[PDB]
A paper describes a structure:
Mammalian target of rapamycin complex 1 (mTORC1) serves as a central regulator of cell growth and proliferation by integrating signals from growth factors, nutrients, energy status, and cellular stress. A small GTPase, called Ras homolog enriched in brain (Rheb), is a positive regulator of mTORC1. Like other small GTPases, the function of Rheb is dictated by its guanine nucleotide binding states: it is active in the GTP-bound form and inactive in the GDP-bound form. The Y35N mutant assumes a very similar overall structure as the WT Rheb with a typical small GTPase protein fold composed of a six-stranded β-sheet surrounded by four α-helices.
Surprisingly, the Y35N mutant, which was initially identified in several human cancers (Lawrence et al., 2014), could significantly increase the phosphorylation level of mTORC1 substrate S6K1 compared to the wild-type (WT) Rheb, and thus is regarded as a constitutively active mutant (Grabiner et al., 2014; Heard et al., 2014). To investigate the molecular basis for the constitutive activation of mTORC1 by the Y35N mutant, we determined the crystal structures of Y35NGppNHp and Y35NGDP at 2.0 Å and 2.1 Å resolution, respectively. The overall structure of Y35NGppNHp is very similar to that of WTGppNHp; superposition of the two structures using the secondary-structure matching method yields a root mean square deviation (RMSD) of 0.45 Å for 169 Cα atoms. In the Y35NGppNHp structure, there is a Mg2+ bound at the active site, which is coordinated by the side chains of Ser20 and Thr38, the β-phosphate and γ-phosphate of GppNHp, and two water molecules in an octahedral geometry. In WTGppNHp, the side chain of Tyr35 covers on the top of the phosphate-binding pocket and forms a hydrogen bond with the γ-phosphate of GppNHp. In Y35NGppNHp, the side chain of Asn35 flips into the bottom of the phosphate-binding pocket and points toward the α-phosphate and β-phosphate of GppNHp (about 90° rotation relative to that of Tyr35 in WTGppNHp). Besides, the binding modes of GppNHp and Mg2+ are essentially identical to those in WTGppNHp. In particular, Thr38 makes a coordination bond with Mg2+ via its side chain and forms hydrogen bonds with the γ-phosphate of GppNHp via its main chain and side chain. When the WT and Y35N Rheb structures are superimposed onto the Rheb‒mTORC1 structure, residues Pro37 and Ile39 of switch I in both WTGppNHp and Y35NGppNHp could interact with Phe977 and Arg1301 of mTOR. In other words, Y35NGDP mimics WTGppNHP in binding to mTOR and thus is capable to activate mTORC1 in a similar way as WTGppNHp. These results indicate that the Y35N mutation induces switch I in either GDP-bound or GppNHp-bound form to adopt a conformation similar to that seen in WTGTP and thus can make a tight interaction with mTOR, leading to constitutive activation of mTORC1.
Numbering used by the authors: 3 to 171
């Protein structure tokens, strides 16, 4: 049997939302992408013996002034909130996006996963692992660091959001 679940991937511009999603879906790293308008993939994945049809909504980068789109606040089973460990701006912005998201969804509990991407860029890192982890803990959210170059880290991100969604019955 298969379960159908819809996941939105959100964050600031150029944090690697598309590259992470593509690494998961297609198993390859894309060196340069167009800025996203909106893409949607359906990917088969098994989590704890359960097969899922994952509908993955890869969204346009938002900044702190972006209206959080209402279409992403209904009928979504899980959220992946992505920043880059190389960008302080992306980290400030993900805090704003999170607040707007929580406003939109209202009194329904939603699974949220915070992801610090581009961890392979050691020389450009400006955010520690610990600051990301502390933020996730304050949100009661899952936390992982990832690299879109590293297939296992991308797979782990999508498995984890599913694990978290399942916990909410
Ligand atoms: N070294 C490294 N580069 C990455 C990683 N993730 C993304 N990039 C690079 O960073 C740039 C932006 O990636 P992209 O996936 O387009 O980011 P995005 O969040 O989808 N941008 P947008 O919000 O405009 O749709 C690309 O050049 C991409 O190859 C990563 O984990 N490591
Ligand atoms: Mg993109």
């Amino acid at each position: 049997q298969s379960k159908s679940r819809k996941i939105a991937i959100l964050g600031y511009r150029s944090v690697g939302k598309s590259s992470l999603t593509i690494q998961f879906v297609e198993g390859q790293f894309v060196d340069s992408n167009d800025p996203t308008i909106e893409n949607t993939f359906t990917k088969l994945i098994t989590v704890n013996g359960q097969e899922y049809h994952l509908q993955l909504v890869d969204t346009a980068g938002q900044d702190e002034y972006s209206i959080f789109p209402q279409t992403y606040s209904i009928d979504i089973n899980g959220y992946i909130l992505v920043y880059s460990v190389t960008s302080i701006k992306s980290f400030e912005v993900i805090k704003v996006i999170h607040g707007k998201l929580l406003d939109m969804v209202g009194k329904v509990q939603i699974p949220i996963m915070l992801v610090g991407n581009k961890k392979d860029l050691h020389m450009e890192r400006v955010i520690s692992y610990e600051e990301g982890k502390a933020l996730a803990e304050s949100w009661n959210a899952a936390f992982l660091e990832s690299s879109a170059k590293e297939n296992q880290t991308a797979v782990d991100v999508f498995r984890r959001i599913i694990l978290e969604a399942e916990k909410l019955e």
